[PDB]
Amino acid sequence: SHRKYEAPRHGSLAFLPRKRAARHRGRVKSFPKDDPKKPVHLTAAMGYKAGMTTIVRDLDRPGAKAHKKEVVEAVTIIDCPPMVVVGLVGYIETPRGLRSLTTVWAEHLSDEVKRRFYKNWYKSKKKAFTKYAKKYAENNGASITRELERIKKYCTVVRVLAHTQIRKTPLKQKKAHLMEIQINGGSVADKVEFGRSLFEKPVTIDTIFEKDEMIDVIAVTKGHGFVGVTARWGTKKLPRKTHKGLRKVACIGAWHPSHVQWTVARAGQMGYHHRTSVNHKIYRIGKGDDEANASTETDLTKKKITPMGGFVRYGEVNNDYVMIKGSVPGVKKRIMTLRKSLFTHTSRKALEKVELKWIDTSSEFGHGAFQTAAEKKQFMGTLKKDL
């Protein structure tokens, strides 16, 4: 007989395989559509997630109830030390898909990247690219300069291999991360020469992104061990007087089709899935050499964005950083991935031009009350340990 009262479905079938992600680093599955009339430019970056904080600004939205008044919004801080180009790859088209056919690395590599190709680096001989270097300084790089011509002739898209400098962060890890970034240049000749220039030289994120524009975020979510049905999918709990368990589901299928189906809710893994979050606004790109990268045009204090005592379960930020409106998937210290957007934004809310007015820098380790130690001292008075 039919179901008495109707109701929607618990959980979504779109994100169906609820299993642990296959790899720890996020995976960009599609790059923005190529346009051959722009100038050459990269289309992605990568960094580390520091924490969250609070700001205050004034709104510019004609017709709203809060037009030209002060709002309170949450933001997140990503720590982005520069990247170093290492090489480039070229793909051609085939009746079975795209495929790569050449790679050309740079002459000298760092210990950071070389540590990635090994699982036991300490008791090794570290001979990663030793013989490859001899290709350079042999017949004047003849073998090197032929592969590049091949990419110029046959290939149709080009990508750049880049790696981070993890030694410039408070992390305990020493193994760098490596990934690919596509170039949307204008011609295959142009975008291979531009790639060649950037060999073994750092590139900063302010040449990649720009303020108050919309981006996409890719990462791997937080992990929970092994959870029941009530928390995994969100089903109602059974009455208090139920024998043989209460936090369950009651009917997992009708007599016929005679098998348990793939659409019923059951216990298993929670978290550590791959996710792609979209439509995030950039509020600020802060430089690292500046010593007032948390001030504003109205709050003329001199301070840096690190709270009083460093972000909890993280160090301090001494590099460039980006401020993003909202939340992003992933815990602190985890490798974040940023990339340009695929959509077209004409909504009068994604086109707003933001100008902040205050940035919180209080301690998140408790009920923090002051902004700077100078402020605390002048208010606190004098203590017994100040001699």
Partner: protein, 137 residues
């Protein structure tokens, strides 16, 4: 075409009191408490009781007061609640008690005076309650 009573433009806030709540009454209409039986702009979902917050219309009866108002169903509006909630400016606030007034379906009050403070949201949406109230927030 008599439009169904529902405040237009009301931003979302934490709903403090559901169906079955007994709030106070703050006006000279002769009632003392109010018993909620419905909420106007309510939705529809299995097992979920409807609820409302400061500012929106409610259908309610009276259970103790002048015998000329009892055993009937009146439209009412809430004016202050006891559960914290935040505005766009980022500050939380809350009163001591739950209270409401009796109105017309068109939006006119029945009584003539309000006794106590009033939430800012109620003033903006209903012009009559604002013009007749004292201290707001």
């Amino acid at each position: 075409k008599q439009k169904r009573g529902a405040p237009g433009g009301k931003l979302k806030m934490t709903l403090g009191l559901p169906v079955g709540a007994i709030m106070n009454c703050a006006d000279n209409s002769g009632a003392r408490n109010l018993y909620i039986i419905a909420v106007k702009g309510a939705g529809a979902r299995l097992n979920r009781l409807p609820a409302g917050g400061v500012g929106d219309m409610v259908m309610a009866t009276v259970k103790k007061g002048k015998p000329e108002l009892r055993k009937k169903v009146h439209p009412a509006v809430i004016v202050r609640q006891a559960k914290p909630w935040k505005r766009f400016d980022g500050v939380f606030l809350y009163f001591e008690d739950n209270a409401g007034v009796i109105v017309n379906p068109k939006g006119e009050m029945k009584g003539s005076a309000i006794t106590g403070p009033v939430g800012k949201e109620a003033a903006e949406l209903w012009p009559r309650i604002a013009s007749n109230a004292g201290v707001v927030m």
